[PDB]
Description:
The complex is a heterodimer.
Chain A: H1 4-7, H2 10-23, E1 27-34, E2 47-51, H3 56-66, E3 76-78, H4 90-97, E4 104-109
Parallel strand pairs in A: 1-4
Antiparallel strand pairs in A: 1-2, 3-4
Chain B: H1 10-23, E1 28-30, E2 47-55, E3 64-73, E4 78-86, H2 95-98, E5 111-114, E6 124-127, H3 132-145, H4 155-163
Active site (chain B): 130
EC number (chain B): 2.3.2.-
GO cellular component, one term (chain B): cytoplasm
Amino acid sequence: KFVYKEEHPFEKRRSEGEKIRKKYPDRVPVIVEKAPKARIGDLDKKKYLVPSDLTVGQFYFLIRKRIHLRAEDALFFFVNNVIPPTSATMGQLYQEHHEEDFFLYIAYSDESVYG
Amino acid sequence: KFKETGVITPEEFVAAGDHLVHHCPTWQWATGEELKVKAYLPTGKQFLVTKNVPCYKRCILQTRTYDLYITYDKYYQTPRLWLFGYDEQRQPLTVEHMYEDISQDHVKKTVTIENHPHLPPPPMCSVHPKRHAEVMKKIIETVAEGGGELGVHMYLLIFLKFVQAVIPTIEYDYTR
């Protein structure tokens, strides 16, 4: 359900993901896109290369700033229809949910249920 | 009627809550944590609480008790149901155990595990009010087509009547 999985074929994504994971082993490639029916600002950038030791809660704060939100505005991440805990690191979230193209896909919205 | 059919304003939420507490004294108002008090609601009437609601079977008896809450969601302008459960030994149920009391239709669709907006952790289950206004709007118009009228006071009574499908074994009060 990701636009990046349509503009890039599966083989081109896997080749880039394998090479990126090989070049930068302490970093993980992440794709972030807005939910189709979300009423919040959009992201000018969707391909991210984030450090493994970066916590999911810290990645919340970066994505929050990139769409110009405050601490009171709602924002939720969805990885395979699961909200990850803010205490887990991006390296742990990647090892558990990265697709066969070696990319971690994350969808964001202002609702706890993106549907 | 209402200011906007389907949703509810903070004053309509108090009016509907005051009628629920009157009709079903097992529900009561509450304030919650001081730092999480909302200014558009009376400090004494922030959300509704009912405690030790029996749950005899899942979705000899292994009876479980539930604390249920009804908070106001300014985003959707609808109520929002919250629930937290205990076993027979008064011990807090794990997340996977509370899902034994949530019907299969809503376990992954309309139920989340978030912090109560007025209380400290541990997080609790919550029926998401994403579709509530659309359903309550259809109900209000149906009782009007039937010759009756769904007053502001009985909004939460009808709301509790229909969310029962999400938790059909948690026996909270909303009648008699």
